[PDB]
Amino acid sequence: KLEAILSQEVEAEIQALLQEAEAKAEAVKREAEEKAKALLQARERALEAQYRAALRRAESAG
Amino acid sequence: LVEEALRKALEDRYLLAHEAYAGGVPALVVVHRKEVDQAKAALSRAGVAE
Predict the structure, then answer these.
(1) If DSSP codes are grouped into helix, strand and coil, which group holds residue A19?
(2) CB contact at 8 A, B32 and B13
(3) Which end of chain B, N or C, is surrounded by fewer C-beta atoms within 10 Å?
(4) Can you list the positions of beta strands (E) in B1-50?
């Protein structure tokens, strides 16, 4: 039959789509974690700068 | 003749249905896309026009 052909045609597209769309929902979850990570790394860098500078200022004053 | 001719060309993955106008029948064959050529060859060979 012609109908036994057709059911294999949907079940084929509808797995490719759902693997593509779990390869976007994975990729985003990665890039966002590495984003979140880097936005606290940069937060680390700032704190040092502002404390190293500050201690020198208060020393020179005294 | 046509029915036998389609069936060798296009196997069993086809639907041939017909309805009667007032003579013979205008007949319609349904085939998968890319088995289009197999079906047309069968008609051309018979001397059946579209």
Answers:
(1) helix
(2) yes
(3) C
(4) 15-18, 27-30
